[PDB]
Design a protein around this ligand. Sequence first.
Ligand code: 1F1
Lengths: 99, 99
Amino acid sequence: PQITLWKRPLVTIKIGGQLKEALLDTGADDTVIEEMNLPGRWKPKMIGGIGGFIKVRQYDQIIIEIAGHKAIGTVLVGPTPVNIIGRNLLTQIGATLNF
Amino acid sequence: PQITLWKRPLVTIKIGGQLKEALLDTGADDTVIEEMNLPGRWKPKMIGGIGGFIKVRQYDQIIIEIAGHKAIGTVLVGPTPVNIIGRNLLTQIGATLNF
Ligand SMILES: O=C(O)c1ccc2cc[nH]c2c1
């Protein structure tokens, strides 16, 4: 699809068999999803976030569906105020900026 | 142009007659530019950046060139480690996310 930026670029995602909405964020290196139960192994991590630093669970090789487009890659799970699709997954679905 | 996201989407900008580089950031509502002299009146805001909070000065009607494209809008000036072009300016240059 072609998504203009007149409002936040929010889309529907599927992750761990659950439908959520998420922000397509070209300024994020990584993908950060809200606290949820995920099938898969995780390792502990800390990342910078809104107003400070947060503990996250890093899940590698997660199947995630972004507006109908399949991606497999790293998802960070923790107390993010917004579900964020970062470049690690935007590259997998072939997302580009155009102007 | 059509910009892939394998690295951070950095472009050259021109603001206050100074050449800089900046991150095209679809996850940002606003534009945040590092400490610099803008010839205008301003109003103080706070923004929750990655790692903590900063105090910024809001400047309106700032003329800016982004990757060759002329835009006018609001810029927040403060101690940010990265120049951020947010949606308020990305809309002005006709930027879209495509996949
Ligand atoms: O999920 C947890 O219980 C947990 C505990 C500690 C850390 C440190 C980074 N991530 C964590 C997750």
